[PDB]
Design a binder for this molecule. Structure first.
Ligand SMILES: *[C@H](C)[C@H]1/C(=C/c2[nH]c(/C=C3N=C(/C=C4\NC(=O)C(CC)=C4C)C(C)=C\3CCC(=O)O)c(CCC(=O)O)c2C)NC(=O)[C@@H]1C
Ligand SMILES: *[C@H](C)[C@H]1/C(=C/c2[nH]c(/C=C3N=C(/C=C4\NC(=O)C(CC)=C4C)C(C)=C\3CCC(=O)O)c(CCC(=O)O)c2C)NC(=O)[C@@H]1C
Ligand SMILES: *[C@H](C)[C@H]1/C(=C/c2[nH]c(/C=C3N=C(/C=C4\NC(=O)C(CC)=C4C)C(C)=C\3CCC(=O)O)c(CCC(=O)O)c2C)NC(=O)[C@@H]1C
Ligand SMILES: *[C@H](C)[C@H]1/C(=C/c2[nH]c(/C=C3N=C(/C=C4\NC(=O)C(CC)=C4C)C(C)=C\3CCC(=O)O)c(CCC(=O)O)c2C)NC(=O)[C@@H]1C
Ligand SMILES: CCC1=C(C)/C(=C/C2=NC(=C\c3[nH]c(/C=C4\NC(=O)[C@H](C)[C@H]4CC)c(C)c3CCC(=O)O)/C(CCC(=O)O)=C2C)NC1=O
Ligand SMILES: CCC1=C(C)/C(=C/C2=NC(=C\c3[nH]c(/C=C4\NC(=O)[C@H](C)[C@H]4CC)c(C)c3CCC(=O)O)/C(CCC(=O)O)=C2C)NC1=O
Ligand SMILES: CCC1=C(C)/C(=C/C2=NC(=C\c3[nH]c(/C=C4\NC(=O)[C@H](C)[C@H]4CC)c(C)c3CCC(=O)O)/C(CCC(=O)O)=C2C)NC1=O
Ligand SMILES: CCC1=C(C)/C(=C/C2=NC(=C\c3[nH]c(/C=C4\NC(=O)[C@H](C)[C@H]4CC)c(C)c3CCC(=O)O)/C(CCC(=O)O)=C2C)NC1=O
Lengths: 172, 162, 162, 162, 172, 162
């Protein structure tokens, strides 16, 4: 549970001194691009149900063993729980790119859910591939400027793909 | 760590929903705040050492007994003055940290949460720190809306003290 | 009723504390939002009747079977069209209410909270309402940041539907 | 898994007592049920493939738009028909499983518990499955008390759908 | 739990029609003066501990029976609870003038606390006089401007005195 | 090669006469143009690589299908991106060449004269190049009269495309 600003504050307090000037110029540029961060975040957020349905749509086209009887996502209840797990992961990705820090995504999902999927018998590979495909579709949905002014989303495609790869690797 | 973006994420997480336009309103407001608050924090960083010494001298002026009586809680000896001005600089650094963070979170986590029992155990009067914070909020020399919210954070520290 | 000032008061009340600078940041942000959002809500109020008829005609166009088959859920007869366009106007009125309120609260309390079981009991496909909301968000004719957050509310209704 | 012997054991366990004559009444009743229900399940196993194809054809007949419009939820292409008739056979297999188990437990655990959110996420109308189950309960061709309780399970699936 | 905007929304929904134009001009003027309300609220909030200490200071100078042994606020624990009750009332006043509606003040205090003070044996008269004196001191602290751009706090003085009188009358 | 001095010589040659004051007026005008145009061409030479990558990324952003579908005309694979950004740099280099030459001659001889049949034979949409040239003319960052005539050359390329 950290912001960007609280991250700089905690680092400056562990140093024990005041915040240096270059960190303040970095935070000024962050405050200039934080809305920029946000535009992707809102256009990412508005299409979330389409994102998770298309992600499960491609995943269960790709691995039909999960839909097959005896598969892990075969049962209707389990399949609803599967879509719930995916939607939760996407929501915490949107939270982490809202606050601009991966510590919220770590705190809320990562440390426990790997052991949860081991204990449940859930294959970590399929949900890792699903989070990867969902992240690819999310950047693909974010990067297209439909009715939006001309700007630069470079570094924020960098950050969003970082968050999605952190989620997919912590899942394993 | 009560900062606006963190608490917006906490609201959206406890509700179990995605982010809405409410958090984006919170965000354009937070960026509006930080757009002056970061420069005001830099200005306080510049004037910090003289403000610390002036606050310590005003505290010695209003409470002259602390310089006189022998006691390890009082700043009669030199180590009391070193530790004393150290916690003056602690208070000022927490003010700058809350100016950067945009909320009362850093002072609430680094200062406020145990200050009452510490002043109870160590025989420190909180009125000394109230006098020092009053001198700081009088002498910080900012202007405008940055000055008003700086005074807001210092007054919050005062109300948390007594 | 998830509106920003209400949820700020709920945060400050559940924490048990007074209001801080965080809620004032929320407030200058909310006023920034409302300063365009109220005029955009008035403009939607002006264009409302033609938008409702256009959404109903687009829904009849994409799903032509609903005009043809006999069934009280389908709008084959005239009372289906009266009730149908009535709930089109319901959706548009909730969009304007969320534009005024500044959050998704009014649609969440008046539309979303029971819509799934209602469409389950009444054999109403939610895709009809998704098509109508898509036509509205295409044809509302606003511009700029008001248009983006209007599309945000309509997309929120779409994601709550399916 | 709401089956009569399982729920009798759950009653006796939650009460903390031994089995009484109540569970033995439940048992002679359950054996009376199974004494026809197993043969009826075998007869449904025999007629299953033609019932599945007839239900799919009746569903295409009542809802002809699903064969026409392009869409991955609709069975316009061939993979939609493979997956579609697969979930027809799923529904029929769950009916036979509840006929063997003697309670609505297998359909409640394999079908019902998530079907609403699945049809919400995938744009599947449940009325398609209601039409298919109505065709199955019309065309299963059983007779007598086995036919009545088969219709009971299918009507239970219908009421759980809409 | 209502705003000004949610109050107009609930009234317009009970009417069943859209919001009329004159209500929108009223809400536009409210959005213009809402900061005016916010500025007044902030200078009310910053002096809250001084307000409650001066209010109890004048009240226990005024009614020394409460400090007298056997009095309701005599015991140290009870006196701390007394100051806590007053600070809670001031906080919910600040919340109600934040949201611009008395429904939060009603919801959080009013309907129960009269019966609470009856059941406790708390004299409702003294706490009513204390809330009245606290409100008088609060408007007196708000109305003076020090280093603030000139503005009309007068519209608010009406509303703040309304909230304080509602609290004092619901206490009784 | 429609450059002003060349076409002045062509006019004087086709008329069969010597040079007059008209060509000298053309010349002091051309020198007036080149006196800023050469430095503007050097500035475009400096910013060229980042402009090429930004134009390619904007083209992938507005037309996301070209990155996805398999096809040798589309830039799904890596060789499509190498060749693609190569013709982005081709367009930018022709813009700089016309900035130096002082007329639309170099782009007319190196790009325009066959571009229609090439895009016809190769299944290349010219709208991709229109989007890239629009991004370049938005992001070149020049100012003043050099910026206006740079936009003139880019708009000429756009009108020659579609
Ligand atoms: C689909 C992508 C993959 C998949 C998903 C799946 N998950 C479950 C069950 C659980 N998943 C969780 C995960 C979380 N709970 C949390 O609170 C959070 C963070 C906030 C996470 C990430 C938990 C705790 C469970 C068990 C309890 C429960 O109701 O859901 C299932 C069902 C297993 C079952 O037997 O019910 C499924 C199917 N599994 C797959 O097959 C895909 C690879
Ligand atoms: C990102 C993938 C693409 C992109 C985005 C982009 N946005 C801006 C600037 C603004 N975007 C907004 C949006 C909103 N403000 C709000 O309050 C809301 C409601 C929640 C929205 C939707 C606004 C208002 C700004 C700035 C202020 C204004 O526009 O009036 C930029 C440039 C400016 C900036 O950095 O903020 C950019 C680049 N542009 C692309 O090309 C990407 C594909
Ligand atoms: C001078 C300002 C006044 C004064 C100060 C004084 N304080 C102490 C001892 C402590 N002060 C603290 C305070 C903080 N620690 C923190 O980490 C922070 C926030 C970053 C604060 C505000 C603590 C924890 C102690 C105990 C640690 C310690 O004992 O060193 C002293 C030393 C007295 C002592 O032995 O305990 C002094 C002199 N006293 C005065 O007379 C001045 C008016
Ligand atoms: C990326 C910008 C877009 C894209 C481009 C693309 N073009 C080709 C193939 C050719 N492009 C040209 C264009 C020029 N040649 C020139 O000499 C000049 C002026 C100096 C221009 C503008 C030509 C002649 C070809 C054919 C030559 C060849 O085949 O290599 C490709 C390769 C596809 C191909 O086999 O033909 C690509 C990828 N395509 C996209 O998807 C981007 C939007
Ligand atoms: C304020 C928020 C709100 C919404 C959204 C709402 C929807 C709503 N629509 C209903 C019916 C209906 N809804 C539709 C709508 C349609 N059918 C079609 O074929 C068209 C595609 C579509 C036209 C938009 C129709 C025709 C009925 C009447 C069918 C019925 O008997 O139940 C009903 C049942 C009440 C009734 O039977 O009259 C509700 C509660 N009610 C609300 O209070
Ligand atoms: C054992 C109990 C059980 C049931 C009931 C079940 C249903 C089920 N049907 C699905 C899809 C589907 N369901 C249908 C069915 C139809 N669409 C039509 O147009 C026809 C009217 C109808 C034919 C019966 C089709 C065509 C799909 C594939 C569409 C998709 O991508 O999601 C999916 C998503 C999996 C996927 O995408 O492949 C589930 C989980 N799964 C189960 O495990
Ligand atoms: C959020 C809204 C809220 C309110 C308003 C509230 C009032 C409240 N005041 C109480 C006690 C009290 N309230 C008072 C206050 C007063 N008595 C006096 O003599 C004066 C007239 C007045 C000072 C203004 C005192 C002295 C007690 C202590 C009674 C006791 O502990 O026996 C109690 C009994 C439990 C306890 O304090 O620890 C409640 C529930 N509680 C709430 O949760
Ligand atoms: C949450 C942190 C925060 C605060 C505190 C804040 C206050 C604040 N009060 C303002 C204005 C003002 N505030 C007042 C307030 C008053 N004048 C009087 O004479 C009355 C006694 C009193 C009300 C009772 C007035 C009159 C103005 C004039 C400008 C305006 O209308 O906003 C402005 C306008 C912009 C500026 O001053 O730079 C700010 C910033 N803004 C913030 O972001």
């Amino acid at each position: 549970m950290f912001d960007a600003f609280t991250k700089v504050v905690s680092q400056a307090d562990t140093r024990g001194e005041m915040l240096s000037t270059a960190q303040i110029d970095a935070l000024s540029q962050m405050v200039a691009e934080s809305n920029k961060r946000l535009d992707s975040v809102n256009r990412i957020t508005s299409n979330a149900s389409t994102i998770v349905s298309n992600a499960a749509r491609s995943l269960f086209a790709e691995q039909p063993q999960l839909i097959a009887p005896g598969g892990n996502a075969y049962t209707s209840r389990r399949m609803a729980a599967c879509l719930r797990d995916m939607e939760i992961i996407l929501r915490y990705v949107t939270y982490a790119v809202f606050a601009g820090d991966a510590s919220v995504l770590e705190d809320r999902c990562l440390n426990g859910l790997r052991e949860t999927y081991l204990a449940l018998g859930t294959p970590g590979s399929s949900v890792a591939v699903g989070v990867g495909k969902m992240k690819e579709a999310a950047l693909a949905i974010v990067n297209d400027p439909a009715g939006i002014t001309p700007g630069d989303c470079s570094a924020l495609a960098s950050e969003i793909a970082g968050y999605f790869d952190r989620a997919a690797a912590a899942v394993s | 760590m009560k900062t606006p973006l963190t608490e917006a994420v906490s609201i959206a997480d406890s509700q179990g929903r995605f982010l809405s336009s409410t958090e984006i309103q919170v965000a354009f407001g937070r960026f509006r705040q930080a757009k002056a608050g970061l420069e005001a924090a830099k200005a306080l960083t510049s004037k910090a050492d003289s403000l610390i010494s002036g606050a310590a001298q005003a505290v010695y002026n209003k409470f002259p007994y602390t310089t006189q009586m022998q006691g390890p809680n009082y700043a009669a000896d030199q180590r009391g003055k070193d530790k004393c001005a150290r916690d003056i600089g602690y208070y000022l650094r927490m003010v700058t940290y809350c100016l950067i963070a945009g909320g009362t979170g850093p002072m609430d986590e680094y200062l406020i949460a145990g200050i009452d029992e510490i002043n109870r155990t160590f025989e420190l009067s909180p009125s000394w720190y109230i006098e020092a914070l009053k001198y700081i909020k009088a002498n910080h020399g900012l202007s405008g809306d940055a000055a008003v919210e700086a005074n807001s954070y210092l007054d919050y520290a005062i109300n948390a003290l007594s």
